[PDB]
Structure 1
């Protein structure tokens, strides 16, 4: 297919392999269903062409969702337990990109509805389409 699908699939596959207690999403969902939590979504944002070469740059997210009123440690625990480790070595993803560096780690919330709470892990990557 095109590069973006491969990228998310490589991350989604590795994350799905071990952990077996979460609903995975390809792209960042808008609404949820109780049965979806714990939810984990892998997606891209800000993808853009770079050249002044065929290099593109994007922000890779792996976000964990849980019911609104849950303590930060719940999200962190899921992250430090079923995600962060996987992200250390993913040969599949590696073969598809030219580079990857840690970026941020944000705690987010359901802006209006207030139905969910989350932890968004982000890496900056560069690749060829």
Structure 2
């Protein structure tokens, strides 16, 4: 439905496990070296599917991106991505009310070489809901 409650539900289900990280809701997110392990959740690229005759259907991509300091070892990002985010994301009771279909998509690593201040890695999902 409205994007607000979807991000609220995913952040609620993601906060319960202890991570000690600052979570940002929505696209704008400004921080510095202090609160580095931040996790941001946002929706992007909404489209009109036009799948079913009965009612409206939409597709949107759900992003979960984590930021780690530059020159952090690769294996550390591996663990943050798989061990923490993947198990919680598979089953969330609050999501199933709103989302008709949720499909995984691959995660990817991006580092910064212009200045070497950040290195992130975002897990991507495909969401099919009704608006």
Q: TM-score under structure 2 normalisation?
A: 0.87
Query: Are the aligned partners of 1:65 and 1:75 in contact in 2 as well (CA < 8 Å)?
Result: no
Query: Are the aligned partners of 1:54 and 1:128 in contact in 2 as well (CA < 8 Å)?
Result: yes
Instruction: Output one character per residue of 1:7-30: Cα deviation in whole Å (capped at 9) or x when no partner.
Output: 111111111011241000112345
1:4 shift after superposition: 0.5
1:113 shift after superposition: 4.0
Instruction: Output one character per residue of 1:57-87: Cα deviation in whole Å (capped at 9) or x when no partner.
Output: 0111111110111122111212223211101
1:31 shift after superposition: 4.1
Query: For the pair shown, which has the larger CA radius of gyration, 1 or 2?
Result: 2
1:89 shift after superposition: 0.7
1:49 shift after superposition: 2.0
Structure with higher strand content = 1
**Stretch moving more, 7-16 or 52-61:** 52-61
| TM-align CA RMSD | 2.0
Q: TM-score under structure 1 normalisation?
A: 0.88
Between the aligned partners of 1:115 and 1:85, the Cα distance in structure 2 is 29
Q: Structure 1 residues 6 and 38 mapped into 2: Cα distance closer, same or farther (>3 Å)? A: same
1:95 shift after superposition: 1.0
1:126 shift after superposition: 0.5
**Stretch moving more, 26-35 or 4-13:** 26-35
Q: Structure 1 residues 108 and 58 mapped into 2: Cα distance closer, same or farther (>3 Å)? A: same
1:37 shift after superposition: 1.4
Q: Do residues 4 (structure 1) and 14 (structure 2) align? A: no
Query: Are the aligned partners of 1:40 and 1:63 in contact in 2 as well (CA < 8 Å)?
Result: yes
